């Protein structure tokens, strides 16, 4: 009943916030992989990740998710601490690799979102 | 009613495939970002990705999911093409970024694994 939908909604919320952070992390990697990483684009993407993470932390009452998100925050500070100026591959087309990676990782992201939408739609339809 | 539960089951199979492919792509990027990437390890991971994808494609009946999976296959072939050049001369100067990226992405993967477990608990329980 209400308790049931509450918990189901808690998990969908977790899936959604973690999905946003996964995309934003990939956004940062895509930027860093280009031949000349756009510092403006990178700092904006870092800002996105930060805003989503902190809103998540503020809007979770769940003791476990709270714990996980705290761990993500710690690891995100370490990611930024170790972010290099660029990731040049001397013998490869960096722009091309960045684009190929971006294309694939977005398709995987969309495949997961399509499957999830299918799961939810079928469960909702079954309620009839 | 069995066809109903089978359609549901095939959706879960597809999301499990998606999660595994994302894990493997993560593994491969971590390797590629090392000061000295293990080409052998990269190869094993890339073959694992292809095995998992083909198993997924062979199982899926849903038309939209089949299309998405075929698109992943095409995109992966394009990514694969860049691999040899990335191994000839590494992108990174030390392992610091690879290690921090790995630590973070694993935490994000775990959070999704837990959430999916929760969605299923709630679905199966009803």
Tell the residue number behind the tokens 């294309």, with chain if given: A103
Q: Which of A102, A96, A103 is nearest to B71 (CA)?
A: A103
Dist CA A55 CA B82 (whole Å): 37
- Long-range contacts at B76-81 (CB < 8 A, ≥ 24 apart): B76/A104, B76/B49, B76/B50, B78/A100, B78/A103, B78/A104, B79/A97, B79/A100, B79/A101, B79/A103, B79/A104, B80/B46, B81/A100
Overall resolution, Å: 1.9
Residue B69 distance to chain A (closest CA, Å): 7
Domains of chain B: 1-126 (1.20.120.880)
Token look-up 């709270």 returns A66
Interface test with A, best of B1, B29, B57, B75 (most A CBs within 10 A): B75
If you ran DSSP here, which 8-state letter would residue A34 be given?
S
Kindly report the number of other CB atoms within 10 A of residue B97's CB atom: 23
Cβ contact, residue pair B89, A91, below 8 Å: yes
Measured between alpha carbons, how far is B67 from B73 in angstroms, rounded to an integer? Answer: 10
Residue of B nearest to A35 (CA): B91
Gyration radius of chain A's alpha carbons: 18
Q: With CB atoms and an 8 Å threshold, state whether B29 touches A82.
A: no
CB contact under 8 A, A71 and B107: yes
Residue A106 contacts residue B22 (beta carbons within 8 Å): no
Query: Cα–Cα distance between A48 and A43 in angstroms, integer?
Result: 9
d(CA B4, CA B76): 32
In the three-class reduction of DSSP (H, G, I as helix; E, B as strand; rest coil), residue A36 is classed as: coil
Instruction: Spell out which residues of chain A touch residue B114, defining contact as CB-CB under 8 Å.
Output: 14, 64, 68
DSSP for A44-65, written as a single string: HHHHHHHHHHHHHHHH---HHH
DSSP string, B24-73: HHHHHHHHHTSSS--HHHHHHHHHHHHHHHHHHHHH---HHHHHHHHHHH
Which has the closest alpha carbon to B79: A98, A36, A90? A98
B79 and A104 in contact by Cβ < 8 A?
yes
Q: How far apart are CA A106 and CA A73, in angstroms?
A: 24
CA–CA gap between residue A125 and residue A127 (Å, rounded): 5
Residues 6 or more apart from B86 whose CB is under 8 A from it? A89, A91, A92, A97, B32, B37
Give the dihedral of Cα atoms B86, B92, B97, B98; nearest 10 deg.
40
Neighbours of A53 (CB within 10 A): 19
Q: Could you tell me if A109 and A19 are in contact, meaning their C-beta atoms sit under 8 angstroms apart?
A: yes
Nearest residue to A86 (alpha-carbon basis) of B27, B62, B100, B93: B93
Method of determination is X-ray
How far away is chain B from the Cα of A21, in angstroms, using its nearest Cα?
A: 8
| Residue linked to tokens 């808690």 | A10
Structure tokens at B76: 């992966």
Cα(B64)–Cα(B42) distance, integer angstroms: 30
Token couple for B30: 């971590």
CA atoms within 13 A on the CB side of B54: 7
């Amino acid at each position: 009943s209400n308790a049931q939908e509450q918990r189901m909604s808690h998990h969908y919320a977790t899936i959604e916030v973690s999905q946003q952070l996964r995309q934003l992390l990939g956004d940062q990697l895509v930027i860093l992989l280009r031949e000349t990483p756009d510092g403006q684009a990178l700092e904006r993407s870092q800002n996105d990740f930060r805003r989503v993470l902190e809103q998540g932390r503020a809007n979770t009452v769940d003791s476990a998710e709270q714990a996980a998100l705290d761990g993500v925050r710690d690891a995100y500070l370490q990611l930024q601490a170790h972010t290099p100026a660029l990731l040049e591959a001397p013998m490869a087309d960096n722009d091309g690799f960045s684009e190929a990676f971006n294309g694939l990782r977005l398709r995987l992201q969309d495949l997961q979102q399509l499957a999830l939408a299918g799961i939810s739609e079928a469960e909702t339809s079954a309620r009839h």
